[PDB]
Design a protein around this ligand. Structure first.
Ligand SMILES: CNC(=O)c1c(-c2ccc(F)cc2)oc2cc(N(Cc3ccc(B(O)O)c(F)c3)S(C)(=O)=O)c(C3CC3)cc12
Ligand SMILES: CNC(=O)c1c(-c2ccc(F)cc2)oc2cc(N(Cc3ccc(B(O)O)c(F)c3)S(C)(=O)=O)c(C3CC3)cc12
Length: 548
């Protein structure tokens, strides 16, 4: 089965697209090498299409069925409810794509009669019709990167707004509750960054001779077959569900999740999908279950001992008991052979690691710093190149997602988020007096509206108070950061230390919540430190979800 079939009609933009870095008066203070930053556009869509279009073969053995039976047994203990129209409506993001049938995200949120009526008719159609393929729109994502001495745009596929509300009605409570029950500690979404760090370190230490590896499948969404999506549905249907929910789930699976026609922004037929849609509600849960299933079965084929898996979407890490260097390397080949038979070959072959910090997953690795007392603190960091390129773009242009804000929240303990992102953007916010203005950002693919003034509390709850006093970062983390700055022509860290004193002083001067940001976020910048005391899960990744 081919992942996609194409008609030849182009994938078209729905608005003007910028590829070149926009520049303003603030741009040079962050980043000088402007021509290294770019954004992807629909002009590279043709290139992506070629990468994501291929034949899938699948060979399923007893290890696969055994694991599947175990997953279903756990799924059978889950009781999920239908959300009402109103509940599903409130989960709809304010700036989500409008319907073709005369209403938008804000009409849905307000329970407008036109929106509510169309949702009711869409739902009724899902109950009464389990065969007719549902239309989808295919777009090129506009995303910002540094040149990798260019990436073609990713493709997003999603159905109409009315359908997206109905998905939430049928399945939101399922995708929010089921994966944790089925996968236990392996379900990565449940942890805050601080809990995840703690889980990883405790898992590494739980093995006598630890070995770990990342496995990243090439173009995972395209590797998802009709069988995979049907198997996912069979898992959902194990739950204790309302009869209405069962029918809607069967309907959505047959008509939408397994595949359907692809329409561009201008309304022309682009082709046909027989793989995972990126923009449906079940994408995150589905990829996580399917990755868990294939990898768990692949662990058994390779005879890996005392495995602990961590899975988040298509990202996978296994930590297990080492059987020896040679024995480990051999068993990974078998793992990859098993995964390939299940349709999920790797982009890069997996490498066994005997140090936790050398494992990268979701672009992140563990590193170590020290708190005020000098005790070791583990935290998750990443290469700051992409965060910094995106920050430079957002310095000059207002975007749908404020990646700088998400990056500060998710990587708050990092050397680069604290010294560069906090310092740069708080200076900008101060200059415009927009500290209290709530901004859209994404945490684990879930959309939130957050005021910068609330960052101290948000950081404390996600990382603990230690995130405001970490020092003595590792030479390797420091060198990676300093090397990235030279590469992009970002000023060196010593300049940011100077700038943070000013920004701290400016924040302290305004009193109130502003001064609290000065005290906690910038305590790293003063030599005479101020004692930091206390300041005063949800289950929806990707697939168009918002919370107040
Ligand atoms: C299976 N892999 C893991 O679960 C993770 C490992 C990992 C690293 C090394 C290792 F050996 C094992 C695991 O690191 C992680 C770091 C993140 N974060 C960054 C982050 C990455 C992507 C997104 B996204 O666009 O969806 C995002 F929102 C945040 S965060 C806030 O710091 O916790 C995450 C979050 C849940 C997605 C997962 C893992
Ligand atoms: C109030 N500020 C200070 O106390 C700090 C001084 C300092 C040194 C001399 C001086 F005269 C005045 C100040 O250097 C620091 C270094 C760091 N680190 C990050 C780091 C590393 C390299 C560079 B550098 O080459 O430019 C850098 F600027 C920062 S580290 C080694 O990992 O602990 C920190 C951590 C973030 C909190 C604080 C200070």
């Amino acid at each position: 089965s081919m992942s996609y079939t194409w008609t030849g009609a182009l994938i078209t933009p729905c608005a003007a697209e910028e590829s070149k870095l926009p520049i303003n008066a603030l741009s040079n203070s962050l980043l000088r090498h402007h021509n290294m930053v770019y954004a992807t556009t629909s002009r590279s869509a043709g290139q992506r299409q070629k990468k994501v279009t291929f034949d899938r073969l699948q060979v399923l053995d007893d290890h696969y069925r055994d694991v599947l039976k175990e997953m279903k047994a756990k799924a059978s203990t889950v009781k999920a409810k239908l959300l009402s129209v109103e509940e599903a409506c409130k989960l709809t993001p304010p700036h989500s794509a409008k319907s073709k049938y005369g209403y938008g995200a804000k009409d849905v949120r307000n329970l407008s009669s036109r929106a509510v009526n169309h949702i009711h008719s869409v739902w009724k159609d899902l109950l009464e019709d389990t065969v007719t393929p549902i239309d989808t729109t295919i777009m090129a994502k506009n995303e910002v990167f540094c040149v990798q001495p260019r990436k073609p745009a990713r493709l997003i596929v999603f159905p109409d707004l009315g359908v997206r509300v109905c998905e939430k009605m049928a399945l939101y409570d399922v995708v929010s509750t089921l994966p944790q029950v089925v996968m236990g500690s392996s379900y990565g979404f449940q942890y805050s960054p601080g809990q995840r760090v703690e889980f990883l370190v405790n898992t590494w230490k739980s093995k006598k001779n630890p070995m770990g590896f990342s496995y990243d499948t090439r173009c995972f969404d395209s590797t998802v077959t009709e069988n995979d999506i049907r198997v996912e549905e069979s898992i959902y249907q194990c739950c204790d569900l309302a009869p209405e929910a069962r029918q809607a789930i069967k309907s959505l699976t047959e008509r939408l999740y397994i595949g359907g026609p692809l329409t561009n922004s201008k309304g022309q037929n682009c082709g046909y999908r027989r793989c995972r849609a990126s923009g449906v509600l079940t994408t995150s849960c589905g990829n996580t279950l399917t990755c868990y299933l294939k990898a768990s079965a692949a662990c058994r084929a390779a005879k890996l001992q005392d495995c602990t898996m961590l899975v988040y979407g298509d990202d996978l890490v296994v930590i297990c008991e080492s059987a020896g260097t040679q024995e480990d390397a051999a068993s990974l080949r078998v793992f990859t052979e098993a995964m390939t038979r299940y349709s999920a070959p790797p982009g890069d072959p997996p490498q066994p690691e005997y140090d936790l910090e050398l494992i990268t997953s979701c672009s992140s690795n563990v590193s170590v710093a020290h708190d005020a007392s000098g005790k070791r603190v583990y935290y998750l960091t990443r290469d700051p190149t992409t965060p910094l390129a995106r920050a430079a773009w957002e310095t000059a242009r207002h975007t749908p997602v404020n990646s700088w804000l998400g990056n500060i929240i998710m990587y708050a303990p990092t050397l680069w988020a604290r010294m560069i992102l906090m310092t740069h953007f708080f200076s900008i916010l101060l200059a415009q007096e927009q500290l209290e203005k709530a901004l859209d950002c994404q945490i684990y693919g879930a959309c939130y509206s957050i005021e910068p003034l609330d960052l101290p509390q948000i950081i404390e709850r996600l990382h603990g108070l230690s995130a405001f006093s970490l020092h003595s970062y590792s030479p390797g983390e420091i060198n990676r950061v300093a090397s990235c700055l030279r590469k992009l022509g970002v000023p060196p860290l010593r300049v940011w230390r100077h700038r943070a004193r000013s920004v701290r002083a400016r924040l302290l001067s305004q009193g109130g919540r502003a001064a609290t940001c000065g005290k906690y976020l910038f305590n790293w910048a003063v030599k005479t430190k101020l004692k930091l005391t206390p300041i005063p899960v949800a289950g929806y990744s990707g697939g168009d979800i918002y919370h107040s």
